Swiss-Prot record:
Phosphorylated on tyrosine residues. It is linked to Hypotonia, infantile, with psychomotor retardation and characteristic facies 1: A neurodegenerative disease characterized by variable degrees of hypotonia, speech impairment, intellectual disability, pyramidal signs, subtle facial dysmorphism, and chronic constipation. Some patients manifest neuroaxonal dystrophy, optic atrophy, unmyelinated axons and spheroid bodies in tissue biopsies. Contains 24 transmembrane helices (TM) that form four homologous functional repeats connected by intracellular linkers. Each of the four internal repeats contains five hydrophobic transmembrane segments (S1, S2, S3, S5, S6) and one positively charged transmembrane segment (S4). S4 segments represent the voltage-sensor. S4 transmembrane segments lack some of the charged residues (K and R) found at every third position in the S4s of the NaV, CaV, and KV channels. Found in a complex with NALCN, UNC79, UNC80 and NACL1; these auxiliary subunits are indispensable for the function of NALCN channel. Interacts with UNC80; required for the NALCN activation/inhibition by GPCRs in neurons. Found in a complex with NALCN, UNC79 and UNC80; UNC80 bridges NALCN to UNC79. Interacts with CHRM3. It is found in: Cell membrane. The chain holds residues 347 to 389 of 1738 of the full protein. Belongs to the NALCN family. Voltage-gated ion channel responsible for the resting Na(+) permeability that controls neuronal excitability. NALCN channel functions as a multi-protein complex, which consists at least of NALCN, NALF1, UNC79 and UNC80. NALCN is the voltage-sensing, pore-forming subunit of the NALCN channel complex. NALCN channel complex is constitutively active and conducts monovalent cations but is blocked by physiological concentrations of extracellular divalent cations. This is Sodium leak channel NALCN.
Amino acid sequence: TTQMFHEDAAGGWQLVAVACLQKMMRSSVFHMF
């Protein structure tokens, strides 16, 4: 479900797709800790 068709403001059929701590919490060293 990467992209879905949806009418935009004008026209339509655009097919669009679909901070520090949130990045760090993926870091390997955090998991090792």
